[PDB]
C-alpha cells in the first residue's frame, strides 16, 4: 500500500535472524506470504532476443489511394533448432503497421522481446497460435504442429473489409484478424529468435509461390515502388554494422497511407483571360511544329491519307488547318497549361517588345516533309534557356498533370503494380509524381518543358509563385556512470550522411524530450549549418559533408569545449578557437550525439586509439586523451527511445499539479488535477494522458457472478470509481475509462477513432464462427461526443465506471443515467483507470474514486490487504501518472546478428541467424513490462530495491533453511545465477 520502500525490506530481513539464531516460523511466514504472490518483488529470468525483418513493401488503404486492397506473400522454413540455450525458438510471420510497430532489441512488454503479435499494430501466427496484443489464441489449424523445419506459411491480407488470413501447407488456418486499424501501411514481417533459417517468397522473380494465391489476391512482389528496389531491412534500427565500426542511425523516414493518394489542384474553376486565347494559337502551332519534326525524325511518313497504321501524318500543312476536334485538341494543351499556370501566382506575358516578332523562323531543308513542307515552321528559339524558376514551375505543372490523371484512373478503379496488365485495371505509373521514377518524370515533363520554353521564346513575364515531435531526433549519450569531472578528453564523430546530427558534450541529467542545445544541459555543435548550440544557437565553424569527422574535445582544467573538423580547429566568428569557455565542471560531462531523420553517424569514443584518426593531428600533442582509452569493455550508450511510456507526474512539474485532497465526509478520497500556468505565460493546451498507478486485475475464472446491505456488500464483486469534470473544463475534452498496460499512443487530438482495436474471429473448417472476441488497448467513453456533454453550464459532470471483475463488463454511467457503453473483456486483464483531458480551465479533472451503494471502492480492487474493506482510501501507492513521449533506454551490448541475402531467382531472399543471445530481464509485476537488468545502472531506486530484495532472499534462506532454499530456487534459477556470475556489466 505504501509503495516500494527499501526499508520495509530491511524490517523484513531483520524479522528473520535473531542475533545469530534464525527463526524458522518467521522465515517460513515471509516465504509463504510474500514470495508466492510474485506481485510485489521484481521478478527476473533469462530470455532470448527477438529480431524482426520485413521486405521493402508497404501497402495501405485510403480514400482514393492508388494501391490495391488484396495482397499475398509467403515464408518457408528451412531449418529450426528448437530450444537452443533453454528457450523456445520464437518464430512468427504476419503483417505490421508502419506507425506503431517499432520493436527494439531488449526490453518490451511482458516477458521477452517483442515480435509480431506482441502489440496491436502487428498480427502474427507461430504455427498453432494467433498472436495479437501479447496474447496467444490457440487456433484450430489442421496441422497444429508449430513451424516445423519443413513448413510453408502463406499469409494474405484483404484491406477492404479488413482481414488477415493464414494458410499452413495449403491447409486453411481457422482464424482471422478482422476490423483492425487501417491507419498506416501494412508490411510483411517475420519475427524470430536466434537459430532459424527462412526464405521470403514474395512472388514473381523474388521467389515462387508453392501454393496459388486465392482468387483476387495480388502477389506482394509487385507492390515495390518504382523509385526503390526490393530488399530486406530491419523494422526500426538505431544501429548497423559498418567497416570502421557500428553506425548509429537516426529515426527512419516512412511513408503514409495519405502519401499514396493524389491531391491535384483544381483548375476547371480557374477563369481564363483573353491573353490565354492570344498565346494559345501560336503555342498549339509550335506544338504541331516540334511534333512534325519528330514525325520526320521517326519512320512516320508524310502521307495526307490520315492512316496511323501506315504511319501517316494527318495534318501535313504548316498552318494547323485541321478539323474542329483536332484543332481544340491542339489548343486545350495551352488552355489547360495556362489555367494551371494562373492557378498559381504566375501571370501571362503579351509579347513584350514584340519578342515573338524578333525571334525568327530557321527552316532546315534536310528534314523535308513530303506533305507539310521543307520544314514545318521549325520556330527555333533565340537561345532562350530555361530559368531555374521556370524549371521548378515545369516540375510543379508535371506533378499536377500526373496527379490529375492518376486521380481519374483511381476514380475509374485502377491500381498500381510493378508489372503492367490492362484487363485487371493495373498500371505501373499510377503512383503519385513524387514517388515516380526519374525516367517517367522526364517523359511527363518533356512536352511541358517544350511548352514553357516556347512561352519564354515569346514575350512572357518570368516569376515564381520520422518528422513528428519527439520522433525526429535520436540522442545517443554515454552511460551516466562514465561522467568526467577532470582531465582532457577527446572523442570522434564521423558523419556518414550530411545533415543534423548535433555532436558534443552534455550534462548527466540531459532531458531526452528537449533537443540538444535548446537548454542548459547540453554543449553541442550542429554541423548542418555549423551552428553551436548552448541555451540557443550561435554561428560558428563551417558546415560539414559526408566523411567529415568531428573530434570533439573537452578540457575540464581549462573549462572549455573545442570542436575540430578533419584535423583543423574550428574557429568562431570572433576567431576564438574555443567554441565554449568558463564551463563549470558541475556534476560531469558525457559524449552525446543527436542524429536526425535518415542520418548515419559513427561515434568513436576512443577505445581503439589507433582507430582514432586525426588524433595525432589534434589532441595527441595538446595533451588530450582518448575517451575510454584504457577501458576494456566498450562504453554502453543510451538511445532516446521514442516509445510513449507512462511515468509519474513530477512534484515540481512547471505546468501540471496533482493535489491529494482528503476524503472527509460526503466526499471520497480523490486526486484532483490543476493547471498552474493556465491563462498566463506558458499556458500550453495539449492532450494530457493520465492514469492511476495501480491496476485492477480481472478474475482468472469468469463465473456468472441508503444504508449498505452487509450481505450484498460481502458478496460484491463489482468495483466503482468516478471522475469529476468541473464547470470550466469542457466536457468535450475529457475521456473517462480504462487502459491496458499496452497503451503507448501519445498522439495529440486523441479520439476514439484512433484507438487500437482488432476482432480475432476464430472459426471452424466448415465456416461457423467459433468465437468473435474483441481486443483493444483502451476502453473509454466518447466524452468528446458525449450525450452527457450536450451551452456552457456551471454544473460538474461526474462519470462513473462500474466494472465487474467476475462477469467482465465495464458499464459506464453519467450523472446517474446509464451510458450505452458496455465494454466486455477477457479474463486475466489488468486495466489501469485513466482519463485523457485537454486543459481548458485551471481546474480540469478529479479522480474521485470512492464507492456507491453495494459496491466496493476501487482501493479494494487494487489492494489485496483491503480486499474486504469497504472504506475508500488513497494509499501512497495510488498516484496520477502522465504519459511521457520519450525516455532513456540502454543500448544492448550485443545485437542479434542476422544475415539476409538472395540465393537466386528461384529461391529468392533468405533470412538466417545462428548466434544465440540471451539477456536477464527485470519484470515489474503491476505494469507488465520488463527491461535489462543492466538498465538498473542508472535507475538507482530500482537498483536499491532489488538489492535489498536479494538481501531479503539471503536472510530468509540463511542458517540452513533448506526448504526456503528449495522455494527460492524457483524465483532465482541456476541459469540466472550463472549468467549473473558471468555478467560483467
Amino acid at each position: 500500500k505504501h509503495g516500494r520502500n527499501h526499508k520495509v525490506l530491511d524490517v523484513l530481513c531483520s524479522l528473520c535472524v535473531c542475533n545469530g539464531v534464525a527463526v524458522r516460523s518467521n522465515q517460513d511466514l515471509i516465504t509463504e506470504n510474500l514470495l508466492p504472490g510474485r506481485e510485489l518483488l521484481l521478478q527476473t529470468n533469462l530470455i532470448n532476443y527477438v529480431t524482426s525483418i520485413r521486405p521493402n513493401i508497404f501497402v495501405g488503404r485510403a480514400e482514393g489511394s492508388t494501391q490495391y486492397g488484396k495482397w499475398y506473400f509467403e515464408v518457408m522454413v528451412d531449418e529450426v533448432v528448437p530450444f537452443l540455450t533453454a528457450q523456445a525458438t520464437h518464430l512468427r510471420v504476419g503483417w505490421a503497421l508502419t506507425e506503431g510497430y517499432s520493436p527494439y532489441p531488449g526490453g518490451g512488454e511482458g516477458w521477452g522481446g517483442n515480435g509480431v503479435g506482441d502489440d496491436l499494430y502487428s498480427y502474427g501466427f507461430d504455427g498453432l497460435h494467433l498472436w495479437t496484443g501479447h496474447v496467444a489464441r490457440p487456433v484450430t489449424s489442421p496441422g497444429q504442429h508449430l513451424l516445423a523445419p519443413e513448413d510453408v506459411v502463406s499469409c494474405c491480407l484483404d484491406l477492404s473489409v479488413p482481414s488477415i488470413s493464414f494458410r499452413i501447407n495449403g491447409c486453411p488456418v481457422q482464424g482471422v484478424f478482422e476490423a483492425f486499424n487501417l491507419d498506416g501501411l501494412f508490411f510483411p514481417v517475420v519475427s524470430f529468435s536466434a537459430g532459424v533459417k527462412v526464405r521470403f517468397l514474395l512472388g514473381g522473380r523474388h521467389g515462387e509461390f508453392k501454393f496459388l494465391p486465392p482468387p483476387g489476391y495480388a502477389p506482394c512482389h509487385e507492390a515495390v515502388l518504382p523509385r526503390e528496389r526490393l530488399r530486406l531491412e530491419p523494422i526500426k534500427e538505431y544501429r548497423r554494422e559498418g567497416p570502421r565500426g557500428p553506425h548509429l542511425v537516426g529515426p527512419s523516414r516512412c511513408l503514409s497511407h495519405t502519401d499514396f493518394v493524389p491531391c491535384p489542384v483544381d483548375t476547371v474553376q480557374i477563369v481564363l483571360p483573353p491573353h490565354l486565347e492570344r498565346i494559345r494559337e501560336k503555342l498549339a502551332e509550335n506544338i504541331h511544329e516540334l511534333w512534325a519534326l519528330t514525325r520526320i525524325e521517326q519512320g512516320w511518313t508524310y502521307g495526307p491519307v490520315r492512316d496511323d497504321n501506315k504511319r501517316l501524318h494527318p495534318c501535313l500543312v504548316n498552318f494547323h488547318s485541321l478539323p474542329e476536334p483536332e484543332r481544340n485538341y491542339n489548343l486545350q494543351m495551352s488552355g489547360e497549361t495556362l489555367k494551371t499556370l494562373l492557378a498559381l501566382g504566375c501571370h501571362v506575358g503579351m509579347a513584350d517588345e514584340k519578342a515573338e516578332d524578333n525571334l525568327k523562323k530557321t527552316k532546315l531543308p534536310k528534314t523535308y516533309m513530303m506533305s507539310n513542307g521543307y520544314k514545318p515552321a521549325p520556330l527555333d528559339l533565340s537561345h532562350v534557356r530555361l530559368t531555374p524558376a521556370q524549371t521548378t514551375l515545369v516540375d510543379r505543372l508535371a506533378e499536377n498533370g500526373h496527379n490529375v490523371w492518376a486521380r481519374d484512373r483511381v476514380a475509374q478503379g485502377w491500381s498500381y503494380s510493378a508489372v503492367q496488365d490492362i484487363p485487371a485495371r493495373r498500371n505501373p505509373r499510377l503512383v503519385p509524381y513524387r514517388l515516380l521514377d526519374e525516367a517517367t518524370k522526364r517523359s511527363n515533363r518533356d512536352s511541358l518543358c517544350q511548352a514553357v520554353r516556347t512561352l519564354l521564346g515569346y514575350g512572357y513575364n518570368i516569376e515564381p509563385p520520422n518528422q513528428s515531435r519527439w520522433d525526429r531526433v535520436r540522442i545517443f549519450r554515454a552511460e551516466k556512470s562514465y561522467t568526467v569531472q577532470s582531465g582532457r578528453w577527446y572523442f570522434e564523430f564521423e558523419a556518414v550522411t550530411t545533415g543534423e546530427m548535433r555532436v558534443g558534450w552534455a550534462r548527466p541529467e540531459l532531458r531526452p524530450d528537449v533537443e540538444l542545445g535548446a537548454d542548459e544541459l547540453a554543449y553541442v555543435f550542429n554541423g548542418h549549418r555549423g551552428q553551436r548550440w548552448h541555451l540557443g544557437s550561435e554561428p560558428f565553424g563551417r558546415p560539414w559533408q559526408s566523411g567529415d569527422v568531428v573530434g570533439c574535445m573537452i578540457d575540464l582544467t581549462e573549462n572549455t569545449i573545442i570542436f575540430t573538423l578533419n584535423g583543423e580547429v574550428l574557429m568562431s566568428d570572433s576567431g576564438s578557437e574555443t567554441a565554449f569557455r568558463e564551463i563549470e565542471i558541475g556534476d560531469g560531462f558525457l559524449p552525446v550525439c543527436s542524429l536526425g531523420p535518415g542520418q548515419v553517424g559513427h561515434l568513436n569514443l576512443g577505445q581503439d586509439v589507433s582507430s582514432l584518426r586525426f588524433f595525432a593531428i589534434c589532441g595527441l600533442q595538446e595533451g588530450f586523451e582518448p575517451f575510454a582509452i584504457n577501458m576494456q569493455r566498450p562504453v554502453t550508450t543510451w538511445f532516446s527511445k521514442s516509445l510513449p511510456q507512462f511515468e509519474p507526474v513530477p512534484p515540481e512539474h512547471p505546468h501540471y499539479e496533482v493535489a491529494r485532497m482528503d476524503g472527509t465526509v460526503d466526499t471520497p478520497p480523490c486526486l484532483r488535477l490543476a493547471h498552474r500556468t493556465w491563462g498566463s505565460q506558458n499556458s500550453l493546451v495539449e492532450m494530457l494522458f493520465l492514469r492511476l498507478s495501480l491496476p485492477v486485475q480481472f478474475h482468472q475464472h469468469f463465473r456468472c457472478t441508503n444504508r449498505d446491505d452487509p450481505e450484498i456488500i460481502l458478496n460484491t464483486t463489482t468495483y466503482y470509481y468516478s471522475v469529476r469534470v468541473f464547470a470550466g473544463q469542457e466536457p468535450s475534452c475529457v475521456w473517462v475509462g480504462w487502459v491496458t498496460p499496452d497503451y503507448h499512443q501519445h498522439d495529440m487530438n486523441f479520439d476514439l477513432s484512433k484507438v487500437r482495436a482488432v476482432t480475432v474471429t476464430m472459426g471452424d473448417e466448415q465456416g461457423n464462427v467459433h468465437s468473435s472476441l474483441k481486443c483493444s488497448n483502451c476502453y473509454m467513453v466518447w466524452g468528446g461526443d458525449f450525450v452527457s456533454p450536450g451551452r456552457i453550464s456551471h454544473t460538474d459532470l461526474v462519470i462513473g465506471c462500474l466494472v465487474d471483475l467476475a462477469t467482465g463488463l465495464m458499464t459506464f454511467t453519467a450523472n446517474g443515467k446509464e451510458s450505452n457503453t458496455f465494454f466486455q473483456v477477457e479474463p486475466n486483464t489488468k486495466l489501469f483507470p485513466a482519463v485523457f483531458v485537454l486543459p481548458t480551465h485551471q481546474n480540469v479533472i478529479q479522480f474521485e474514486l470512492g464507492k456507491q451503494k453495494n459496491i466496493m471502492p476501487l482501493s479494494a480492487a487494487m489492494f489485496l490487504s483491503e480486499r474486504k474493506n469497504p472504506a475508500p482510501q488513497c494509499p501512497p501507492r495510488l498516484e496520477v501518472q502522465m504519459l511521457m513521449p520519450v525516455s532513456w533506454s540502454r543500448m544492448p551490448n550485443h545485437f542479434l546478428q542476422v544475415e539476409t541475402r538472395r540465393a537466386g531467382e528461384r529461391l529468392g531472399w533468405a533470412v538466417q541467424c545462428q548466434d544465440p543471445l540471451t539477456m536477464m530481464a527485470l519484470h515489474i509485476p503491476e505494469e507488465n513490462r520488463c527491461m535489462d537488468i543492466l538498465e538498473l545502472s542508472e535507475r538507482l531506486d530500482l537498483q536499491r530495491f532489488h538489492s535489498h530484495t536479494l538481501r531479503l532472499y539471503r536472510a530468509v534462506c540463511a542458517l540452513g533453511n533448506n526448504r526456503v532454499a528449495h522455494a527460492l530456487c524457483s524465483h532465482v534459477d541456476q541459469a540466472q545465477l550463472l549468467h549473473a556470475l558471468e555478467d560483467a556489466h
Epitope: 478539323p323 476536334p325 483536332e326 475509374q412 505509373r429 517523359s443
Partner: nanobody, 126 residues
C-alpha cells in the same frame, strides 16, 4: 466517369450483316475517339478501323471485311456494321472511349494514358 458497354453477337454464315452497338454514357471528355480492339482466341489483341468525332475513317491492320463503323454524338453511341464475315473474324470485340484520337499523340504521357475500356462481346462466324 464514361461507362461504355458493347453489345451484339451472333452466329451465321460468311457475309452476314452484324450491328455491334457500343454506348458510352458519361462526359464528352472521351468523345474524341472510339477505338475498337478484337481479341481472337489465342491471338494478340489487334486494332479495328477507328473513328474520331466526326466519323473520320482510318483503316487498321485487321480492317479486312466491310467495317462500316459510324456513331452519333447525341447519346454517344457507335454502331459497327460487319456486312462481310470470315472464319478468322471470330473474336471478342471491345470498345474504348478515349480522349486521344487516331495516330494523334502530341500530348504528355498521362494525357496519352487516359483510356476507358468496356465489357466487349464475343462474335462467332460459321
Amino acid at each position: 466517369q464514361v461507362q461504355l458497354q458493347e453489345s451484339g453477337g451472333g452466329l451465321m454464315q460468311a457475309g452476314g450483316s452484324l450491328r455491334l452497338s457500343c454506348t458510352a454514357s458519361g462526359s464528352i471528355f472521351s468523345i474524341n475517339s472510339m477505338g475498337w480492339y478484337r481479341q481472337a482466341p489465342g491471338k494478340q489483341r489487334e486494332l479495328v478501323a477507328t473513328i474520331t468525332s466526326g466519323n473520320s475513317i482510318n483503316y487498321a491492320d485487321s480492317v479486312k471485311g466491310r467495317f462500316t463503323i459510324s456513331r452519333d454524338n447525341a447519346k454517344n453511341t457507335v454502331y459497327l456494321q460487319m456486312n462481310s464475315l470470315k472464319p478468322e473474324d471470330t473474336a471478342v470485340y471491345y470498345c474504348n472511349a478515349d480522349r486521344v484520337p487516331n495516330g494523334y499523340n502530341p500530348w504528355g504521357t498521362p494525357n496519352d494514358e487516359y483510356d476507358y475500356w468496356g465489357q466487349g462481346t464475343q462474335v462467332t462466324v460459321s
